[PDB]
Design a protein around this ligand. Structure first.
Ligand SMILES: *[C@@]1(O)C(=O)N(Cc2ccccc2OCC)c2ccc(Br)cc21
Ligand SMILES: *[C@@]1(O)C(=O)N(Cc2ccccc2OCC)c2ccc(Br)cc21
Lengths: 304, 304
């Protein structure tokens, strides 16, 4: 027992991290097979970021201007291309440490692990969730661009995120591994505000199921509710509307605990209306929304 | 910016995880050089755990009874010995993936990363702290014994913890890598209650410094206090007494923010006396005590 914000073991991803330098700019690259992926703004000076024309800026760059270093060995760059907001540097050597992998574009509400890197070297690993306004509440300092988000299914790494920007609000924006930004952000030093950060309702319910499994039961009540009734409360507290798809994904958790999804919704409803009255749930004094129903099943069953 | 409960990149530790089986019991082992470390209760049946005599139980075990599997390859066991509560299985092959390493016995209040494993395979990684009552609030299910805690200084892995037990309260007990339990616990299925879980005061202050650095400033007040005055409040709220050593370790954080340690103590004091009034600090609605002053400096500077 016990429930923790757990990240995936990052070894498979650490083996892909490289450093990319173009002129005076250094960031992280992801080396998979004979290709290094990195944010296209590696070609920018801090001056260029106000209003860059990446196609024009790229015309001035040749293969030899992209210095790619894997630990202490230098990769030979034999090609470069821009796909959306990422650069693809074809190197002459396949990364011998390339794990089985996929590139996936995740939905808001989904969680992933971030291996924060600086100059091609990993600093740490933490769990994240793509917020409903398509930002992530990360921990990134200058030089962290190029760090990636991922999930792992047994031996396959699904890369979902690549870090590109920090909003003036201290929240983070980035792309999937095809270079497309999540949400409306652009790789430009401009005023970009994020939308409402709503709470991921399905994740809070799943975390309430994790809490009942681990002994925190005080919040369980004598009530029930309906999808429409619950959603009126969810709307008042800027929570995502719960759908029958969400009820369905919560099925296994409902099955193992014997607490019907709508009964848990009524516990959540009372907690929204009354707060926690100085109490805690799984060591938290707020309703945690960055564990999906899959993460809870995975942690509560011991999947490796 | 942004502040997260970050774990160390676990790749170096994943390369050491092996599976150990003795009879019907399977747990995790740590393979470093030509030695596999694992909890000695691998030799026990669930029946033996009520009152085991490990020396007697071990007399019945030979090298060939300890099955050690690294991924899918079988290690040949050429020796076995019991050091305190750990077994040391000498294998005929040095682990080619052994990183630079040390064995350290940490103090209460110190933090470390746990690579939770099942059958020699990593499931996830999370940050922990050795509680002042020498327990850890982990996430461990059956088969997680043998999973290790560690810190990393550049390329050197300092192993500090090895998981052995779950208390009837759902908290966790284990040893350092010499087999000595932290706190008074024994590897036996008996009533073992933990002492008072006090809050690690120096870590809360360090986390308040991390919050000021990242923009959460609302809790800063017009007051100051003294070590003795603050400690009267700390005693009332079961917080660890703050010492001049703690004030000293907080020096760099005090220096970079310009907020004197005793002024931060007065912010902490008001927060203890008044609560957070529905507000949050670094996305938490409680005072976080599992970031040491070193963890905060490391995260706020980008150490790799
Ligand atoms: C990341 O390492 C990086 O390249 N970078 C610079 C950057 C990125 C987006 C917009 C502007 C800009 O530079 C302004 C001069 C950056 C910024 C913040 C973070 Br958290 C990481 C990185
Ligand atoms: C760990 O995998 C393990 O071996 N184990 C069994 C155990 C450990 C301590 C006391 C008793 C006992 O078995 C009782 C039958 C165990 C128990 C709990 C956890 Br979280 C991990 C492990």
């Amino acid at each position: 027992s016990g429930f923790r914000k757990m990240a995936f073991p990052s070894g498979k991803v650490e083996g892909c991290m490289v450093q990319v330098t173009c002129g005076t700019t250094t960031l992280n690259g992801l080396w998979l097979d004979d290709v290094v992926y990195c944010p296209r703004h590696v070609i920018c000076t801090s001056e260029d970021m106000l209003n860059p024309n990446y196609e024009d800026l790229l015309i001035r760059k040749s293969n030899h201007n992209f210095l790619v270093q894997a630990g202490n060995v230098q990769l030979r760059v034999i090609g470069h291309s821009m796909q959306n907001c990422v650069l693809k540097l074809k190197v002459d050597t396949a990364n011998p440490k390339t794990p089985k992998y996929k590139f996936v574009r995740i939905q808001p509400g989904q969680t992933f692990s971030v291996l924060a890197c600086y100059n091609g070297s990993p600093s740490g690993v933490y769990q994240c969730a793509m917020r409903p306004n398509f930002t992530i509440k990360g921990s990134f300092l200058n030089g962290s661009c190029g760090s990636v988000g991922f999930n792992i299914d047994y031996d396959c790494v699904s890369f979902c995120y690549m870090h590109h920007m920090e909003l003036p609000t201290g929240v983070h924006a980035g792309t999937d591994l095809e270079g497309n930004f999540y949400g409306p952000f652009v790789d430009r030093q401009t005023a970009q505000a994020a939308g409402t950060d709503t709470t991921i309702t399905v994740n809070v319910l799943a975390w309430l199921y994790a809490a009942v499994i681990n002994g925190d039961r005080w919040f369980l009540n004598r009530f029930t509710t309906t999808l429409n009734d619950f959603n009126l409360v969810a709307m008042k507290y800027n929570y995502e509307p719960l759908t029958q798809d969400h009820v369905d994904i919560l099925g296994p958790l409902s099955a193992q605990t014997g607490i019907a999804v709508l009964d848990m919704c009524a516990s959540l409803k009372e907690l929204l209306q009354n707060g926690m009255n100085g109490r805690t749930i799984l060591g938290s004094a707020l309703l945690e929304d960055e564990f999906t129903p899959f993460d809870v099943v995975r942690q509560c069953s011991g999947v490796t």
